[PDB]
Design a protein around this ligand. Structure first.
Ligand code: SIA
Lengths: 6, 118
């Protein structure tokens, strides 16, 4: 997915 | 532009129910093939659990199963979250997410802090 992580 | 409108804080009574108004927007450039997937999260930073998932509910955490529901209309850009049978454990923050395409997803960082009282 990406962006925020986790 | 991209965004989501919802109250910042909301309070409800244990045992009762709670409805969180929510609306989202995205650039008119907009693609229309993903069927727009709405997803509500609980404790995004910590345990990050799924409250609802228009894609497939099998991804919904057992904690919220049948206790949460999406009261919205993608065609109106409505993402209202209904919480059934409130409990103190339901207190915390909720953040909405929607996906029109693979590289066109958005998450509301503001969220809505819900605190269940007596
Ligand atoms: C990441 C993400 O994975 O959410 C990449 C997305 O493409 C991006 N969306 C847009 C429209 O740029 C998001 C977005 O920037 C954040 O969710 C905003 O909070 O970030």
């Amino acid at each position: 997915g990406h962006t925020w992580g986790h | 532009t991209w965004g989501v409108s919802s109250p910042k804080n909301v309070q409800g009574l244990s045992g009762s129910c709670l409805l969180i108004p929510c609306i989202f927007s995205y650039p008119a450039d907009v693609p229309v093939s993903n069927g727009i997937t709405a997803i509500w999260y609980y404790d995004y930073s910590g345990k990050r659990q799924v409250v609802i998932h228009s894609g497939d509910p099998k991804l919904v955490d057992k904690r919220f199963r049948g206790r949460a529901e999406l009261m919205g209309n993608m065609d109106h850009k409505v993402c209202n979250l209904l919480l059934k049978d409130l409990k103190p454990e339901d207190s915390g923050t909720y953040n909405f997410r929607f996906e029109i395409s693979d590289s066109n997803r958005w998450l509301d960082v503001k969220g809505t802090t819900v605190t269940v009282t007596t």
